[PDB]
Amino acid sequence: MAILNILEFPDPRLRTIAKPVEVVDDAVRQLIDDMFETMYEAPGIGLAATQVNVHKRIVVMDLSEDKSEPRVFINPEFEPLTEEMDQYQEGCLSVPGFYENVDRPQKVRIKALDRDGNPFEEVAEGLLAVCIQHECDHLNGKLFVDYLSTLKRDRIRKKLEKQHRQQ
Template identity: 50%
Template sequence: MSSLEILQPPHPTLKTPAALVDEIDGALVRLMADMLETMYAAPGIGLAAPQVGVSRRVVVIDTSEEKNAPVRLLNPTLTWRSDTFDVAEEGCLSLPGQFADVKRHTAVVASYLDPSGKERTLEAEGLLARCLQHEIDHLDGILFTDHLSALKRNMILRRLIKQRRARA
């Protein structure tokens, strides 16, 4: 396993809808393992393949306290969304150190393929529901900042640019 580079805006892969996974092979299994290692090291609770430069519909998530319950989702889609919403602070590994309140459905149901190719369904609420929505957004070329007003989005992007310049 190896840690992967996490892309940041304005990298075009982050804004491009990802392609469906059509074959589960050794390279894809390695990618998921590397994504989990990268996510845990960051540290984070979710990571989508476009964030590491791979334009495929692959997501890894682990919202457990112990970081020992990873979920690997291939071609995930939301098949149901609650009529209720909540607003909570979100961050993103592609936007390090940047946080904002985002409105999301309080519960969702996702269908996906597991790493063996078996069709699965995941019912989620709370943090897991929020994380699923966030990561599936990545697969569609959407960042959490796209859910914000233009003013808030631009403030976050300016802070990110300022951080990069300070590190350079």
């Protein structure tokens, strides 16, 4: 069980497009367990493999307060089920410390493979709909600061670059 390093904006490796997982084997499940331990230790409720510099399409999440409901989505995809949008103040383990409003479709249908490689779908609303979209964006090399004004993003980017220099 390893705690992996989480890349942070503006590390260009966060812009890489993740490649699909072609077989869910024990190597993939071990990575998932390390991604869950990394996410729980952060702590965060969602983590995409791109963020730990593994460019494969795997997202782990656990939206509960007690770390009792882990969820795995491999080769996830979602499709909005409404044009209605909800605004949620998002944060991100790779943009630590910043939380900003992002509007996204309120309800979406996810399709993915589960921890055994079997395909399933799931309708998501609430925080699950926000999280799966945010995490699928990671696999496509997108971050939530990309939705913000360019001057806020630059201000966040400069703040983090400054912190990375001091660290």
